[PDB]
């Protein structure tokens, strides 16, 4: 109270006021946009959505006593909002419940009164007109309820709030859908509770009823129009099944649904991450890394968040299985410090022709290799180490014999050197030929590529792609 | 006060980092320690070399009573004599500050610098302080404050000076040598050697010649290189004074490769006796070797190693494995054969090489306009 | 059945039974390792070492899927090799297999010398012949340059 | 020293005289424009970064 109690009066009043005004003028701005000119594609819906993910998750994590976030439920309990006198009477109430909670205290939350704060604000003459107002006021309790992390009769209050939200979600999507379409926010709101619906089960058990319902929402969506609902719902079905260390790879293979067509530059970044994992595990490496790159290079506007850490951690692994490897520690991070050392020690022993240091590093760093989430390195690297030597020699020597390459590759067998190169030519490591007469192994002959119909075909890729960059960028801008 | 101070920086460096080299560096710097009143910046050189020795309190009371005699002077000056700007107060303040650079540590100097910098309205005084920042910033190799004061000097001081800046031409390249910029900026502004007197502004001149000759063989292959290093005169005489360096140049130019290794081995072994040779002794060697192979493999499409076995040096399997590392490094666009014994090269005939460049840069820009395209349009 | 993609994607269910113990999974994953290294000898030396019964119908197909790939690798621009090269590329000292390959395919033994036909290409390209598709590409450019304003 | 246009063989002791393409000015002037185009895309990049 002398030190800590004096800095108790400053935090409520103005953040109580200025956070309340911004969501009011947006919700009033969304309502007029819902009533007239539903073309709200470049409207304030997404930027308010980008506020709630960022600010309201870092501004507050507790239910904010002195009635700051805890006062939102006794404020919004008496809300009807049907007619023009009825709205003006409620606008009289909006002023009065802020003025009372600003001056004095009204109704306090003691981390247990979650059922009175969710059923009576849902009730009391509430209508199905102001749909984002209702969906926001149910989604905003879900954040401090999880961020409290007390786990004392809390899961059921999470669960009932989700089911009520889903009941309000189905009541929107089926009855009176005439020009409201709140799917642009409801997808993430569904995604946020499902992250909590996964995590709460992940504290205790698996999750499968969440996915059967997620099929059912995917069954009741995807017939209307793809409006970035199906995109995120495809990922939420996909993330758990990859997280399960059993199967469901073939379910994603037959999943003929790759057409989200837009992602707000948010989903397609991480959508291209997951399908890169699956093309990598299905031994299709060339298409994997080029879209693993396309995911990483898309959105670097992130200050050490972790998926950027994870795509970069995998991309260097699929590069090592191909054979080439550029620098990776050039953008060092305080989070990269515990991840830059094992892979750099890994790519050191791979590119060199050593084995005992390689096994020592493999024995030392296997605990991290399991904690990262790839196990196939144990089988796919011993092909790489034995082919790194033959690729470097075939790149260097134009014509090396088998008896020399057998002694150079510490092999002690001059009989399988024909078999290694025959595996190397078949697998596409290098284009050579074995003259099986005394052991002549030749290489390429011609270097002319220029007047031999190479350049035009790449050039036809450059023209057709950039005019498509052009015309899409033409249509995307002349909106007025 | 900061005149014999680059030599000290070598003797600190020569004694500290190699431990086998500890015989004479402790002999001459200990004489430099007990002289010059160097009483702040020697604790590490005493903690990293020897245990201790009592001459310490003797010099502490002398530097203190001198500083106090210097402290009582400029306070009486500013209490009796009222002149500001650049006055008798001012050259008292820099004489304190130069006493701080010679005797004390950097921290009291830099706060006396920023104090006396705001008491400057001329440009030569402001040039002098930035001369002092850069001189001590090289002494403690600080790559932080050099990023500021140089930009402060070139933009705000050097618009009125005239040929006072060849010294700060030389200090820039000196940072570029201890940095990685040892390629084309380093040799370009080392090309004018029109100062030989050695001063506060100019270091040892023979060593300046050896630096500007060692770096002028990486910038440029032979684009009439010989006009600037052989047809020059003032560079030519001082390398005519030095038989080792002059032998190294003619071996590279006239293609005497046999002695070239012997000259290169002498240099790299001598390179260890330096204070700024750190990004050199793993880089300068292999860059010259790959430059020596570049001009030798030029003009021979079907060269054999049987000519390399006596005209170039000795050995066969050593040259083979070194070429096999260098091709697999990614450079030296050639191919080697073992059983025909023909190092058959593949040089692009100036149309592939134009095409190889245009296909990289177009892909790098198409990536750059893709990545820009996805940031925009939501 | 030559499903290497299905091979690895199955290997996700076992946490720590692959390295620690359980030869019944350790024996196929060591076998896949030996196909990726390049030691055909280590395959058939390990064919006579089975933990449970013999795995006979598995190694018979494993013999079957190797020897045709070996036969598919050799039917190339090679012309003739003696019996000793087919004693090094293939195996056993005069089995019915060389008679099996003689009746099915060629590899006909004559005067101690086989004969393999050349299976290369001989296509005499001219490549100014696909000049219509090039003019098609030039026109569709200026189509896409114009025609939408 | 570029006073002569040819190549040598050590394996065969064979002097071979060849020639060069004189034309290079089309692609050289082309690749410099790529550098100009690269910086303006960088200059639109940080502009679109700073303000949407």
């Amino acid at each position: 109270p002398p030190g800590g109690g004096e800095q108790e009066p400053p935090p409520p009043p103005a953040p109580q006021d200025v956070e309340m005004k911004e969501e009011a003028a947006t919700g009033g701005g969304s309502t007029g946009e819902a009533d007239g000119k539903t073309a709200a594609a470049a409207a304030e819906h997404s930027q308010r959505e980008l506020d709630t993910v960022t600010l309201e998750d870092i501004k507050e994590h507790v239910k904010q006593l002195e009635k700051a976030v805890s006062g939102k439920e006794p404020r919004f309990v008496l809300r009807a909002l049907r007619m023009l006198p009825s709205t003006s009477r409620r606008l009289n109430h909006y002023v009065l419940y802020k003025a009372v909670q600003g001056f004095f205290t009204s109704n306090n939350a003691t981390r247990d009164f979650l059922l009175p704060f969710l059923e009576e604000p849902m009730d009391t003459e509430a209508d199905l007109q102001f749909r984002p107002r209702t969906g926001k006021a149910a989604s905003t309790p879900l954040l401090p309820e999880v961020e409290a992390y007390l786990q004392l009769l809390v899961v059921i209050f999470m669960m009932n709030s989700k089911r009520y939200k889903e009941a309000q979600k189905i009541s929107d999507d089926l009855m009176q859908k005439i020009s409201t379409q709140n799917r642009r926010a409801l997808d993430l709101v569904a995604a946020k509770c499902y992250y909590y619906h996964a995590r709460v089960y992940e504290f205790l058990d698996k999750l499968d009823v969440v996915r059967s319902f997620l099929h059912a929402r995917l069954r009741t969506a995807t017939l209307r129009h793809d409006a970035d609902g199906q995109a995120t719902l495809l990922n939420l079905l996909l993330r758990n099944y990859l997280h399960y260390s059993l199967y469901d790879q073939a379910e994603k293979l037959v999943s003929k649904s790759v057409f989200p067509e837009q992602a707000n530059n948010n989903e397609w970044a991480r959508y291209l991450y997951y399908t890169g994992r699956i093309k990598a595990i299905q031994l299709e490496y060339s298409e994997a890394r080029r879209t693993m790159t396309n995911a990483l290079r898309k959105a670097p506007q992130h200050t050490a968040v972790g998926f950027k850490q994870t795509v970069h951690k995998l991309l260097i692994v699929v590069e090592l299985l191909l054979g080439e490897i550029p620098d990776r520690l050039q953008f060092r991070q305080p989070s990269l410090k515990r991840s830059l050392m094992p892979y750099f020690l890994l790519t050191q022993a791979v590119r060199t022709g050593n084995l005992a240091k390689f096994n020592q590093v493999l024995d030392q760093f296997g605990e991290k290799f399991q904690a990262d989430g790839t196990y196939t390195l144990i089988i796919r690297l011993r092909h790489n180490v034995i082919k790194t030597g033959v690729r470097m020699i075939s790149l260097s020597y134009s014509r090396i014999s088998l008896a020399d390459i057998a002694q150079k590759l510490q092999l002690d067998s001059p009989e399988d050197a024909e078999f290694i190169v025959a595996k190397a030519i078949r697998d596409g490591v290098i284009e050579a030929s074995i003259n099986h007469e005394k052991g002549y192994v030749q290489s390429k002959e011609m270097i002319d590529i220029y007047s031999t119909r190479e350049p035009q075909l790449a050039f036809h890729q450059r023209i057709s792609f950039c005019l498509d960059i052009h015309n899409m960028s033409v249509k995307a801008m002349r909106f007025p | 006060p900061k005149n014999p101070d680059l030599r000290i920086a070598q003797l600190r460096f020569l004694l500290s980092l190699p431990e086998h080299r500890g015989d004479a560096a402790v002999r001459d710097e200990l004489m430099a320690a007990v002289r010059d009143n160097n009483m702040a910046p020697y604790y590490e050189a005493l903690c990293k070399s020897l245990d201790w020795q009592i001459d310490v309190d003797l010099l502490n009371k002398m530097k203190k009573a001198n500083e106090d005699e210097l402290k009582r002077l400029d306070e009486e000056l500013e209490d009796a004599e009222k002149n500001l700007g650049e006055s008798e107060i001012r050259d008292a303040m820099m004489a304190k500050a130069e006493y701080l650079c010679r005797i004390g540590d950097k921290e009291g100097a830099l706060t006396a610098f920023r104090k006396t910098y705001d008491k400057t309205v001329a440009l030569g005084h402001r040039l002098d302080i930035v001369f002092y920042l850069l001189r001590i910033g090289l002494f403690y190799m600080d790559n932080d404050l050099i990023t500021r004061n140089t930009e402060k000097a070139k933009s705000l001081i050097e618009e009125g000076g005239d040929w006072d800046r060849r010294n700060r031409l030389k200090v820039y390249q000196g940072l570029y040598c201890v940095a990685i910029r040892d390629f084309k900026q380093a040799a370009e502004l080392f090309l004018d050697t029109v100062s030989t007197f050695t001063s506060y502004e100019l270091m040892d001149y023979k060593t300046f010649v050896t630096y500007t000759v060692y770096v002028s063989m990486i910038a440029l292959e032979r684009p009439d290189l010989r006009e600037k290093v052989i047809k020059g005169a003032e560079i030519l005489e001082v390398l005519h004074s030095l038989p080792a360096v002059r032998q190294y140049l003619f071996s590279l130019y006239e293609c005497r490769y046999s002695v070239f290794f012997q000259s290169l081995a002498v240099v790299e072994q001598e390179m260890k006796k330096d204070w700024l040779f750190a990004p050199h002794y793993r880089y300068y060697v292999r860059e010259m070797r790959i430059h020596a192979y570049s001009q030798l493999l030029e003009s021979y499409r079907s060269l054999t190693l049987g000519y390399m076995a006596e005209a170039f040096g000795v050995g066969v399997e050593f040259i083979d494995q070194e070429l096999s590392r260098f091709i697999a490094a990614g450079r030296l666009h050639c191919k080697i054969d073992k059983v025909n014994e023909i190092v058959e090269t593949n040089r692009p005939d100036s149309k592939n090489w134009q095409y190889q460049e245009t296909i990289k840069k177009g892909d790098l820009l198409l990536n750059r306009v893709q990545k820009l395209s996805r940031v925009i349009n939501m | 059945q030559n499903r290497v993609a299905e091979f690895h994607t199955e290997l996700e269910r076992l946490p720590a039974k692959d390295i620690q113990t359980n030869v019944y999974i350790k024996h196929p994953v060591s076998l896949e390792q030996y196909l990726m290294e390049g030691s055909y000898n280590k395959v058939f030396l390990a064919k006579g070492n089975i933990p449970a019964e013999s795995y006979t119908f598995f190694i018979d197909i494993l013999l079957d899927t190797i020897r045709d790939e070996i036969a598919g690798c050799i039917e190339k621009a090679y012309e003739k090799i003696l019996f000793t090269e087919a004693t090094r590329i293939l195996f056993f000292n005069t089995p019915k297999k060389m008679t099996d390959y003689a009746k099915k395919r060629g590899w006909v033994l004559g005067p101690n010398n086989y004969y393999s036909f050349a299976s290369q290409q001989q296509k005499p390209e001219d490549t100014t012949i696909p000049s219509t598709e090039l003019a098609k590409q030039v026109i569709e450019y200026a189509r896409q340059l114009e025609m939408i304003v | 020293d570029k006073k002569f246009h040819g190549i040598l063989d050590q394996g065969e002791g064979v002097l071979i005289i060849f020639d060069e393409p004189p034309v290079d000015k089309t692609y050289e002037a082309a690749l410099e424009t790529i550098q100009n185009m690269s910086k303006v895309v960088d200059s639109l990049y940080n502009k679109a970064k700073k303000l949407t």
């Binding site: 470049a42 409207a43 450059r462 023209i463 792609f465 950039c466 005019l467 960059i469 052009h470 015309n471 960028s473 033409v474 995307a476 801008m477 002349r478 909106f479 007025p480 | 245009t358 177009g362 820009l365 198409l366 306009v369 820009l372 395209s373 925009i376 349009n377 | 450019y141 340059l145 | 082309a30 424009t33 790529i34 185009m37 303006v40 895309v41 639109l44 502009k47 679109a48 303000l51 949407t52």
Partner: peptide, 30 residues
């Protein structure tokens, strides 16, 4: 390289200006 680069970046610069001009009137109409 004249079509695919020079015509492309102009359309991108035309995209930047109108979307800024679209959002400036949209934030200042009311």
């Amino acid at each position: 390289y004249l079509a695919s680069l020079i015509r492309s970046v102009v359309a991108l610069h035309n995209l930047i200006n109108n979307k800024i001009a679209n959002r400036d009137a949209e934030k200042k109409e009311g």
